[PDB]
Paper text:
Immunoglobulin G (IgG) antibodies contain a complex N-glycan embedded in the hydrophobic pocket between its heavy chain protomers. This glycan contributes to the structural organization of the Fc domain and determines its specificity for Fcγ receptors, thereby dictating distinct cellular responses. Unlike other glycoproteins, IgG harbors two glycans which are buried in the cleft between the two heavy chains, and are thus not solvent exposed or readily accessible on the surface of the molecule to conventional probes. We previously described an approach to overcome this challenge and successfully identified synthetic nanobodies that can distinguish fucosylated and afucosylated IgG glycoforms. In the present study, we present the crystal structures of the afucosylated IgG-specific nanobody X0 in isolation, as well as in complex with afucosylated IgG1 Fc.
However, glycoform-specific nanobodies deviate in CDR sequence from these published models, likely resulting in significantly different loop architecture and requiring that we solve the structure of our clones in isolation. We crystallized an intermediate affinity (~142 nM) afucosylated IgG-specific clone, X0, and determined its structure by molecular replacement, using its predicted structure from AlphaFold 2 as a search model, to a resolution of 1.8 Å. The loop architecture of the crystal structure for CDR1 (residues 26–34) and CDR2 (residues 46–58) aligned very closely with its predicted structure, however, electron density for CDR3 (residues 91–108) deviated considerably and packed closer to the globular Ig fold of the nanobody than predicted. Superposition of the apo and bound structures of X0 revealed minimal changes in the CDR1 and CDR2 loop position upon binding to IgG Fc. However, consistent with an induced-fit model, the CDR3 loop undergoes a large conformational shift, curling downwards and wrapping around the IgG C’E loop to gain better access to the buried N-glycan at N297. This is demonstrated by several CDR3 residues that in some cases move >9 Å upon binding.
Residue numbers in the entry: 1 to 120
Write the structure that this text describes.
Amino acid sequence: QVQLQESGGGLVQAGGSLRLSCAASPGISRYKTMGWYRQAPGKERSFVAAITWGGLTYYADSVKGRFTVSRDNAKNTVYLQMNSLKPEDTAVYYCSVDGGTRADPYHYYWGQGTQVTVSS
């Protein structure tokens, strides 16, 4: 079976930090880009951060300078270090890998989701 498995969420005061981690099935992530998305109630799922196999990172404008995505290619694991958290960051966070080849999120594999709540 194909599995992505996340952890690290929680409840934290504004200005704090969290670290999300995600472990991927032995073959769906190698040579491929791994990413993080988030979804607040009543909103569509939206991009947060991604890191290519070669190590290039890119971020949503709203988290640039605050979040850092990294990855251990050998362990098939991706991480999201979340600093300077804001109430607007509250959402369910999902790690993701494209099961297709078009960056079309209808084709993505998703983790189960991990709740992040930032109290003001």
